[PDB]
Amino acid sequence: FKPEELRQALMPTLEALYRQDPESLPFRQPVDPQLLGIPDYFDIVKNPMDLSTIKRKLDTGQYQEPWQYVDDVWLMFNNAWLYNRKTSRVYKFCSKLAEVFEQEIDPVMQSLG
């Protein structure tokens, strides 16, 4: 696929995540442990990812196959589930966003091939 054609296929899945409010709000920027007052974050999460980074990569054509994008999205979720406690707001927001993502990406992927 051409860069723009793949971007157009994937973009609605990313838009769906941004549309979730308040659940996407912690995910719209890189985690900033210094500002958040959580100095253990980068001792635990070695490969950070967030929506703004995925958006930039998508908009600049860096995703050359769908699994490359899907992998980044799951990285973002898996980092949040690793770091945050199960009872925390962010963990619960992560679970909601993952459910939204599955609902959006599965039909997209089913339509590639």
- In the complex, which residues of this chain contact ligand 2LK (CB under 6 A)? 22, 25-27, 29, 31, 36, 38, 80, 83-84, 90
- Closer Cβ to ligand 2LK, 6 or 23, answer by number: 23
Closest distance between ligand 2LK and the C-beta of residue 42, in Å?
11
- Closer Cβ to ligand 2LK, 14 or 80, answer by number: 80
* Sign of the four-CA dihedral 103, 97, 54, 84: negative
- Closer Cβ to ligand 2LK, 41 or 66, answer by number: 41
